[PDB]
Amino acid sequence: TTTATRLTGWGRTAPSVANVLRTPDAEMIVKAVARVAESGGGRGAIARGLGRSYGDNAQNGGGLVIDMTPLNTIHSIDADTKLVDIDAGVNLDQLMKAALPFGLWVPVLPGTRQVTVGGAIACDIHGKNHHSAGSFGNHVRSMDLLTADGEIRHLTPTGEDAELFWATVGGNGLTGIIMRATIEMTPTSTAYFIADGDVTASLDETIALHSDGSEARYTYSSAWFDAISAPPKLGRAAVSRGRLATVEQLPAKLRSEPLKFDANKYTFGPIGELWYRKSGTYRGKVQNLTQFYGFLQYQFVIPTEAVDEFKKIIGVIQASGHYSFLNVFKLFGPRNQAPLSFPIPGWNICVDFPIKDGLGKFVSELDRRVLEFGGRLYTAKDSRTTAETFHAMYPRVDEWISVRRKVDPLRVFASDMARRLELL
Ligand SMILES: Cc1cc2nc3c(=O)[nH]c(=O)nc-3n(C[C@H](O)[C@H](O)[C@H](O)COP(=O)(O)OP(=O)(O)OC[C@H]3O[C@@H](n4cnc5c(N)ncnc54)[C@H](O)[C@@H]3O)c2cc1C
Ligand SMILES: *[N+](=O)c1cc(C(F)(F)F)cc2c(=O)nc(N3[C@H](C)CCC[C@@H]3C)oc12
Numbered sequence: 001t002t003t004a005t006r007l008t009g010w011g012r013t014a015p016s017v018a019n020v021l022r023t024p025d026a027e028m029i030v031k032a033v034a035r036v037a038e039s040g041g042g043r044g045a046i047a048r049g050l051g052r053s054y055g056d057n058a059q060n061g062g063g064l065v066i067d068m069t070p071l072n073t074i075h076s077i078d079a080d081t082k083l084v085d086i087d088a089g090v091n092l093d094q095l096m097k098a099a100l101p102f103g104l105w106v107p108v109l110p111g112t113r114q115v116t117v118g119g120a121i122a123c124d125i126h127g128k129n130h131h132s133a134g135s136f137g138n139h140v141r142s143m144d145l146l147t148a149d150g151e152i153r154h155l156t157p158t159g160e161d162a163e164l165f166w167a168t169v170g171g172n173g174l175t176g177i178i179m180r181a182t183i184e185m186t187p188t189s190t191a192y193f194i195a196d197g198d199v200t201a202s203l204d205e206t207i208a209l210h211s212d213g214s215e216a217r218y219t220y221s222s223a224w225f226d227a228i229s230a231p232p233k234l235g236r237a238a239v240s241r242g243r244l245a246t247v248e249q250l251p252a253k254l255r256s257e258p259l260k261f262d263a264n265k266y267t268f269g270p271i272g273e274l275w276y277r278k279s280g281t282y283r284g285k286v287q288n289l290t291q292f293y294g295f296l297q298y299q300f301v302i303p304t305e306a307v308d309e310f311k312k313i314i315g316v317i318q319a320s321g322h323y324s325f326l327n328v329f330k331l332f333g334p335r336n337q338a339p340l341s342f343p344i345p346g347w348n349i350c351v352d353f354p355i356k357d358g359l360g361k362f363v364s365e366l367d368r369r370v371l372e373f374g375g376r377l378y379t380a381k382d383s384r385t386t387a388e389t390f391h392a393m394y395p396r397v398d399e400w401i402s403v404r405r406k407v408d409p410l411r412v413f414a415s416d417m418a419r420r421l422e423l424l
Contacts (some may be wrong), residue, residue: 001028007065011054011297014383016061016416020048024070026179033177034150036064037412044414047173049116050091053123053380054297056416057172063414066177068118075180077102082185083141088118088178100259104185105244107139109293111328118178123380124170124341128293131333132219133186135343137169138336143181148412152179157337167403169338172379174413174423175404188244190258193220193292195242197282203235203311210331219243220292225329227318227351234318235311237329238280245286254286261288296353298363301332302375304346309373316369317351320362324351339396339403342378350381360384379417387422397423 002019021032036045043063050069051058059065071089078084079102086095093113096106108120109127119125121143126135133139145153145168153176155165168175196218200206206223215221218241225237247258254260266272302310317324328350332343353359367389370377376393377385391397401423411424418424 001032002064005065007048007051007059007061009054009056009058009383010052011295011383014056014059014416016056016059018060018063018065020065020067022067022070026071029066029177029179030146030150030152032064032066033146033148033412037148037150037410041411041414044412046413046415046418047088047118047122047177049089049119049122050114052112052115053119055379055381055383056420057123057379057418058119059416060414061416068116068177071179074098077104077185079103082187084183084185085180086117086183087180088121089116091116092120097261099185100191100261102185103187103189103259105188105191107133107184107186108136111293117181117183118173121169121178121181122171122173123378124336124338124343125380126332126343128220128222128330130343131215131221131331134334134336135341137166137338137341139184140165140169141182141184143168144179145175146177146179148176148408148410162337163403164407166337167339167400167407169336170340170342171338171400171404172340172415172417172423174415174418175407176413186244188259189247190245190250191261191289192245192250192254192258193242193287193289194245194249195240195282195285195287195292197280197285198239198241199277199280200235200237200239202232203314204232206235206237206239206329207307207311209239215241215331217241221330223329225327225349227314227324227327230318231315235314238276240292242287242292249284250286261290294355296355296359296363297350297381298353298366299348299350299378299381300366300370300375301342301344301346301348302370302373303344304331306373306375307347309369310347313366313369313373314349316366322353322356322359322362324353326350326352339400340379340394342376342380344376346375379421385421387420390421 045064046060071087221241223237
């Protein structure tokens with residue numbers, strides 16, 4: 001039934017060997033669980049999706065890893081209720097293609113579409129529209145959770161069972177296996193964005209641009225971000241903000257099929273500085289999805305009010321010797337009821353660090369400042385933080401652990417991450 005396999009997160013670090021069940025039969029899955037809750041606890045069981053999480057939340061070395069990608073049935077889409085009803089194994093790319101013809105848009109998209117619905121919920125993923133749409137769990141209207149006791153619970157965000165619902169959202173698969181869910185989609189008349197591009201010269205004007213209230217005019221906003229140049233160049237950004245185009249705004253060629261889809265010498269001179277600023281500055285640019293959308297991935301958010309502390313963390317980063325080219329910055333909006341949900345209103349930033357000597361000790365310092373300044377790290381990007389740091393970052397973890405205690409008293413569900421962060 002099972003196959004012992006060598007599993008890594010997307011970052012390809014910290015491998016561990018687990019027995020991997022990979023069946024489309026919801027029965028075998030329910031039974032493989034009781035075949036684990038019968039032998040005491042052992043090393044338990046964790047669900048796995050498309051394995052895009054960099055962390056170790058979808059590994060369970062010496063235990064059972066259940067691959068959910070065979071469960072990829074889209075059961076129904078309804079354009080009137082905007083409800084979509086899918087198996088946890090369907091990915092967001094599959095789902096986006098199926099829903100477009102109904103005038104429905106996936107409400108939260110991450111930077112890769114090869115992500116299951118299970119994973120989208122379990123990490124409570126965010127995207128470029130967080131400040132307007134919240135994260136993924138805000139759009140889940142119901143889900144079917146295979147619990148440790150073998151029963152299948154129907155959860156909804158309100159009424160009774162809300163607590164277990166909101167613990168499963170961002171629960172990293174540690175309340176049990178999500179089998180099926182209903183998502184409320186976002187209505188759209190096209191598959192296109194209208195985008196305004198902006199460029200900044202300093203971290204100061206980047207913050208100002210995100211504080212002047214202009215942000216309330218776009219549903220989608222993010223930025224490429226300079227983490228290398230010394231001040232005051234440091235933290236200049238190419239800002240890309242937009243919203244879904246109506247049909248009226250499409251060029252005539254496209255207005256027929258609105259829901260479709262398919263380094264030089266100058267580069268560092270004053271001319272390319274002129275090129276980069278000119279090409280990064282635009283208005284009303286219509287773009288499709290793909291146009292608009294040995295390393296250590298590191299992402300954190302700092303509460304909105306601690307802006308000076310945010311600027312200081314950026315300073316620490318560029319003066320650290322560790323250089324990062326791909327940096328995305330965004331202002332998150334309001335959070336949700338999930339105790340372990342990563343997003344809070346404030347300054348979010350994703351950096352990519354070339355693995356080299358001293359990096360591990362340096363990021364441990366970074367952790368310390370992020371913690372100190374009231375922010376947190378993201379489990380879907382994280383493999384190396386500590387339980388003390390995690391627990392302090394997420395003050396509601398105790399609230400969460402209790403809920404999990406009820407629904408899995410015998411530690412049927414476990415992972416490399418749960419043991420490391422002491423969420424088990
Ligand atoms: C290039 C790239 C860009 C990314 N951009 C973003 C981004 O912009 N925003 C963002 O939030 N994230 C981003 N991510 C991270 C990614 O969206 C999340 O880690 C996501 O959870 C991955 O989904 P998955 O299906 O691969 O799940 P996996 O990585 O296989 O599993 C992740 C977690 O979900 C749990 N899980 C999976 N299936 C189930 C289930 N059926 N029931 C219960 N639990 C389950 C697993 O146990 C594990 O804890 C990015 C990743 C990559 C590689
Ligand atoms: N950071 O990794 C990050 C953050 C955000 C958001 F704005 F939502 F906060 C969005 C991201 C995105 O859309 N894509 C990516 N990637 C980075 C550069 C590393 C992995 C590749 C993708 C393109 O990151 C985002």
